[PDB]
Amino acid sequence: LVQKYLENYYDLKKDSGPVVKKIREMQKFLGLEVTGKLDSDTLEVMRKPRCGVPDVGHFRTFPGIPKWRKTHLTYRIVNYTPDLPKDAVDSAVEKALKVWEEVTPLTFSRLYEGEADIMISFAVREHGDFYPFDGPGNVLAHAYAPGPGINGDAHFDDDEQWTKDTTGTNLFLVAAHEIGHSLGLFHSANTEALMYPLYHSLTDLTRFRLSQDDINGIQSLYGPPP
């Protein structure tokens, strides 16, 4: 468990000393106590649902480019999850994009056919890319950094119970985080940041907002709104 967790999220030698060092890097990043041992608190954090994108970097197979070379992006919802009515998914995705439009000069237009910049889809287990999903729990979704083709796309594990509220896995929250990667953001070590790797089942969705860290990160790439 801990081995592959460090392999997948902290690029630990794919082929003890090195492990304790990685355990510590993980503890520093996830806001735990920097000991180096598999504490009760540490083994617990590793069972919590999170984003599939690594913490110390980007997906090696599709690095992409640092940021979009244009401010007017297009998106398209390829398929839907049966857990929710089509209009609820559409709203969730639109509100997620709106969060980023607000703090940048970026715009998003929806396409219903063709090749859009950001393609959103639901999949389970093996879905064509090198990172298969893992059933309910653990990895919730993953997204790729800016670029052509598959880059910029966001995949959501359809083995999760996606909800409009917080009775399951909130689609809005996860989509907002994943769109962040689609625009060029990495994971943050700040526990109150949307870009934090672990899913925060927060009580009040109305009290939701990007933290200053999220804003600073996205504005350092595209600038502030005009």
Whether 178 is catalytic is yes
Among 105, 135, 149, 225, binds a copy of itself (CB under 8 A): 149
Stretch that binds Zn ion, among 69-77, 89-97, 105-113, 155-163 (CB under 5 A): 155-163
Looking at the DSSP bridge assignments, the partners of residue 162 are 169
Alpha helices in the chain, H assignment, sequence order: 2-9, 17-29, 40-45, 86-101, 171-182, 212-222
Q: Determine if residue 134 is labeled as part of a ligand binding site.
A: yes
Torsion of CA 141, 145, 149, 153, to 10 degrees: 30
Among 1, 40, 130, 165, binds a copy of itself (CB under 8 A): 130
Q: How far is the CB of 195 from Ca ion (least distance, A)?
A: 19
Sheet with 107-110, edge to edge strand ranges: 107-110, 72-77, 118-123, 154-157, 141-143
Stretch that binds Ca ion, among 72-80, 83-91, 121-129, 145-153 (CB under 5 A): 145-153
Within residues 57-76, the interface with a copy of itself by CB under 8 A covers: 59-64
Exposure string over 2-30, b if 16+ CB within 10 A, otherwise e = eeebbeebbebeeeeeeeeebbbbbbebb
Q: Determine if residue 200 is labeled as part of a ligand binding site.
A: no
**Pair of tokens at residue 47:** 């069972």
Looking at the DSSP bridge assignments, the partners of residue 74 are 109
Exposure string over 107-137, b if 16+ CB within 10 A, otherwise e = ebeeeeeeebbbbbbbbeeeeebebebeeee
Report the residue number, 54 or 152, with the smaller CB distance to Ca ion: 152
**157 scored as a contact of Ca ion (CB under 5 A):** yes
Report the residue number, 129 or 134, with the smaller CB distance to a copy of itself: 129
Q: Which does 112 bind (CB under 5 to 8 A by kind): a copy of itself, Ca ion, Zn ion, none?
A: none
Measure the CA–CA gap between 144 and 147, rounded to whole angstroms: 9
Stretch that binds Ca ion, among 31-39, 122-130, 152-160, 199-207 (CB under 5 A): 152-160
Among 129, 134, 159, 213, binds a copy of itself (CB under 8 A): 129
Give binding residues for Ca(2+) as ranges.
83, 117, 134-135, 137, 139, 149, 151, 153, 157-158, 160
Which residues make up the interface to a copy of itself (CB under 8 A)? 59-64, 115, 126, 128-130, 148-150
Active site residues: 178
